[PDB]
């Protein structure tokens, strides 16, 4: 319904490239300013106060770039900092949590369906996803903090016994067999097939992808046509070495 060209994308590091990939594939925006807090990544192992402050400082970064909409690609910042970012900023901020709730409403008509939330420690300890799902009447929601997937994925460990063992470590205690599996972390789309293949091979579920969900939400909220910019302009900024972050983008975006 609303109007809204130049976009910002905030993430703790290179994980947000999974959201940038969705944005770029949808071809909805012509200019995107990506900022990864790669000097301080990860956020998910840290405390709400630290993370909330990180989100507010991300706003200070974007202020000189005259963006019209800020996407918080980071599920951790979305879960912990979004409300504070919203109150301190004059521009719209859309996180990757709320859009996934809407996507589930649209894709999961069984309100009793087992749902499994995967995320960082901070995301899962916030109960952000559980609360929002309960508010929408879902009654059978489990959560699981798969902290070590982040560093594993960042070391390009996308297969093998070390990934399979880490999944065993985290998934084995699960009680309910999920019918929905929320990838509530920027990183986890890069192992989505393995996560689907684990729950199927040790007992596929509807995998909710945060990037795809935020894209669909933005089309509805702002009436944005796909294929409206064939080559969007993406600028990369980082608190750490920007060349390191741009080189990672080359890998994450061709994946």
Ligand X SMILES: N[C@H](CCC(=O)O)C(=O)O
Ligand Y SMILES: Cc1nc(-c2ccncc2)sc1CN
Give 1 or 173: the residue with its C-beta nearer to a copy of itself: 173
Q: At what angle do helices 210-222 and 98-107 cross, to 10 degrees?
A: 90
76 known member of a binding site: yes
165 known member of a binding site: no
CB 81 within 8 A of CB 56: yes
CA angle 225, 227, 228 (to 5 degrees): 65
> Binder to Cl ion among 1, 2, 3, 49 (CB under 5 A)?
49
Contacts to ligand Y from residues 23-82, by CB under 6 A: 24
Q: Is 229 a catalytic residue?
A: no
The verdict on 234 binding ligand Y (CB under 6 A) reads yes
12 known member of a binding site: yes
Q: How large is the C-alpha radius of gyration of the chain? A: 17
The verdict on 254 binding ligand Y (CB under 6 A) reads yes
Catalytic residue among 74, 132, 152, 163: 74
Q: How many CB atoms lie within 10 A of CB 59?
A: 19
Which is it for the CA torsion 48, 247, 73, 118, positive or negative? Answer: negative
**What's 232's DSSP letter?**
-
75 known member of a binding site: yes
The verdict on 253 binding ligand Y (CB under 6 A) reads yes
Residues 6+ apart with CB under 8 A from 201: none
Residues involved in catalysis: 74, 185
Please report, as ranges, the residues that interact with Cl ion according to CB under 5 A: 47, 49, 241
Please report, as ranges, the residues that interact with ligand Y according to CB under 6 A: 24, 232, 234, 250, 253-254
In the annotated binding site for substrate, the residues are 11-12, 43-44, 75-76, 186-187
In the annotated binding site, the residues are 11-12, 43-44, 75-76, 186-187
């Amino acid at each position: 319904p609303r109007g809204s060209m130049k976009i910002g994308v905030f993430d703790s590091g290179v994980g947000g490239f999974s959201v940038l990939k969705s944005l770029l594939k949808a071809q909805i925006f012509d200019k995107i300013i990506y900022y990864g807090d790669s000097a301080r990544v990860p956020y998910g192992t840290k405390d709400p106060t630290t993370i909330k402050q990180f989100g507010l400082e991300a706003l200070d970064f974007f202020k000189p770039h005259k963006i019209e909409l800020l996407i918080v690609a980071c599920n951790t910042a979305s879960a912990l900092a979004l409300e504070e970012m919203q109150k301190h900023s004059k521009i719209p901020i859309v996180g990757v949590i709320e859009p996934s709730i809407l996507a589930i409403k649209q894709q999961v008509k069984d309100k009793n369906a087992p749902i499994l939330v995967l995320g960082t420690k901070a995301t899962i300890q916030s109960n952000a996803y559980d609360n929002a799902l309960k508010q929408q009447g879902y009654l059978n929601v489990s959560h699981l903090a798969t902290s070590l997937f982040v560093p594993l994925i960042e070391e390009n460990i996308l297969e093998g016994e070390l990934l399979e063992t880490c999944m065993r470590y985290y998934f084995t205690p699960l009680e309910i067999l999920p019918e929905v599996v929320i990838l509530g972390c920027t990183h986890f789309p890069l192992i989505a097939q393995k996560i689907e293949g684990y729950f199927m091979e040790h007992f596929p579920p509807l995998l909710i992808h945060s990037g795809d969900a935020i894209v669909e939400y933005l089309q509805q909220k702002y009436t944005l046509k796909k294929n409206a910019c064939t080559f969007p302009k993406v600028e990369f900024h980082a608190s750490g070495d920007v060349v390191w972050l741009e080189k990672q983008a080359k890998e994450w975006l061709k994946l």
